[PDB]
Ligand code: HEC
Ligand code: HEC
Ligand code: HEC
Ligand code: HEC
């Protein structure tokens with residue numbers, strides 16, 4: 247009913263609104279964001295990582311929709327989503343919501359294998375992971391949020407209602423995907439690659455099964471399939487790599503590797519990203535035995 251209190255004295259969960267000084271009477275905006283401060287302060291040790299000026303104050307006090315001098319005119323949009331934040335010579339380097347989450351996927355071995363070969367779509371479901379407010383908020387409450395006159399008890403009630411109705415999407419079972427796949431499209435100098443498809447997916451999922459960040463953004467049941475089966479609709483039976491990646495040079499599609507290179511770059515890309523000890527990329531027979 248009431249969320250767990252924070253040690254910091256920040257609200258446990260917080261509705262964040264599109265704060266600006268230009269009137270916005272029709273509520274032309276994204277859904278507000280309910281930020282779970284409790285979860286974040288328990289995992290991120292230093293308050294100042296986020297509150298980069300040292301002030302434990304709402305970001306929008308300086309970073310408004312239009313920008314303003316207190317935030318060096320860096321807007322709300324930039325503060326919350328920036329991904330190319332320069333390192334600061336002196337003092338703190340700010341983080342945004344998106345940049346820290348990205349750092350998680352690059353710097354953590356259990357994430358960095360898949361995320362070395364994923365190009366995130368960042369579609370509406372990605373936005374909605376944060377832009378996630380309860381349907382109960384009214385347009386009048388939105389206006390007050392924007393204008394800064396929403397009562398703190400109203401903000402917390404909206405935040406708690408939102409948090410308590412949140413549900414994590416369960417990833418499909420690896421049992422609904424092939425056990426092994428005999429990858430023989432190109433077989434010539436080597437035997438087919440007997441790819442341990444289910445072993446792979448099962449191992450990758452086990453290492454992230456309780457991770458709250460992953461759970462939130464991996465938000466379609468078949469989404470982890472797209473790690474490898476990219477650029478096609480989510481499906482239990484996606485098209486073969488070689489439907490899109492030709493065996494030979496395809497000058498009409500210079501961004502697409504040919505099929506051998508497609509396998510190598512994807513399989514080896516993940517192996518390198520999560521520091522897989524065997525097979526090394528220089529080992530030419532562990533993924534496929536030499537042909538007689
Ligand atoms: C969490 C990691 C976020 C993701 C993913 C996206 N947004 Fe976001 N956005 C976030 C916050 C914390 C805020 C501030 C609170 C608010 O709702 O204003 C924002 C703000 C915006 C804005 C500016 C305000 C507005 O005009 O409503 C825009 C235009 C915006 N966000 C757009 C947007 C889109 C289109 C996204 C998916 C491509 C998206 N955001 C993702 C946090 C997060
Ligand atoms: C990033 C992962 C954060 C960490 C770590 C901490 N805080 Fe935080 N805090 C963060 C956000 C995105 C927000 C919401 C701002 C909004 O627009 O509503 C907050 C909010 C607070 C507040 C409320 C401030 C206000 O509304 O004026 C306080 C008092 C606060 N945070 C304190 C605080 C402390 C002491 C922390 C370390 C123990 C801490 N925060 C960590 C993001 C993050
Ligand atoms: C005024 C007291 C601020 C508050 C509160 C927050 N930020 Fe801020 N931020 C402020 C300034 C003056 C600057 C420029 C600092 C510099 O060294 O240049 C910034 C910058 C950022 C950035 C970097 C943008 C970029 O480099 O393109 C981000 C991502 C950012 N701020 C985020 C941010 C968040 C998430 C805040 C609440 C947790 C927040 N800032 C508060 C001023 C102030
Ligand atoms: C690193 C300095 C972070 C910043 C800045 C923000 N987030 Fe984050 N987030 C971070 C971690 C390490 C985690 C997982 C915590 C755990 O217990 O494992 C998360 C998680 C989320 C989630 C999912 C859980 C939840 O709160 O519902 C979301 C939707 C999320 N983060 C949103 C979010 C927003 C809106 C932020 C900017 C206002 C933001 N995060 C900053 C690390 C960091």
Ligand code: HEC
Nearest residue numbers: 347350357360366367368450454457459460463470472473
């Ligand atoms: C392969 C089995 C994965 C593992 C292990 C992890 N992630 Fe993942 N992630 C994967 C896919 C296929 C996608 C979809 C990309 C898209 O947007 O279409 C994602 C998405 C995310 C996101 C959202 C995209 C982004 O902001 O970069 C986040 C924040 C995310 N994943 C986090 C995350 C973390 C923290 C992980 C380790 C605990 C992790 N993922 C593992 C595939 C896979």
Ligand code: HEC
Nearest residue numbers: 423424427429446470471473474481482483484486487488
């Ligand atoms: C990379 C780590 C993968 C993940 C995650 C998933 N699959 Fe996969 N799958 C992968 C490869 C390299 C291949 C070979 C494709 C080729 O054209 O050579 C496959 C194959 C399949 C197939 C076809 C099997 C066949 O007999 O031809 C299916 C039906 C399939 N994959 C389904 C699938 C699903 C549903 C996934 C998520 C649960 C999934 N795969 C993940 C690589 C990877």
Ligand code: HEC
Nearest residue numbers: 474475476477478485486487490501502503508509511512
């Ligand atoms: C068409 C529906 C595709 C299927 C099926 C697969 N891939 Fe793909 N891939 C496709 C495009 C359009 C592109 C080019 C993207 C660009 O930057 O222009 C790619 C690219 C790759 C790459 C290069 C790195 C990357 O951008 O991801 C690799 C390593 C790759 N594709 C491998 C690959 C494999 C092994 C597939 C079967 C599991 C596969 N692709 C399917 C389009 C399509």
Ligand code: HEC
Nearest residue numbers: 359360439441442449512513516517520522524525532533
């Ligand atoms: C991450 C998204 C991966 C992709 C893409 C591929 N592999 Fe992989 N592989 C991965 C890990 C993390 C490991 C270590 C074992 C574990 O799960 O902890 C492996 C290991 C292998 C091995 C060794 C033994 C085995 O488990 O089968 C082989 C021969 C192997 N991988 C082959 C392989 C091929 C042929 C791939 C593309 C079709 C491929 N891997 C992709 C992680 C990932």
Ligand code: HEC
Nearest residue numbers: 429430431432433434435436439509513525528529530533
């Ligand atoms: C797994 C991580 C691999 C490693 C390491 C290497 N190769 Fe590979 N290669 C892999 C796959 C999944 C495939 C497709 C197999 C098929 O028959 O469709 C391939 C394919 C080739 C091919 C073309 C097929 C053939 O001639 O049999 C060649 C010539 C090839 N690979 C060469 C090669 C060499 C020399 C490697 C060590 C540097 C090497 N591969 C590593 C997966 C993997």
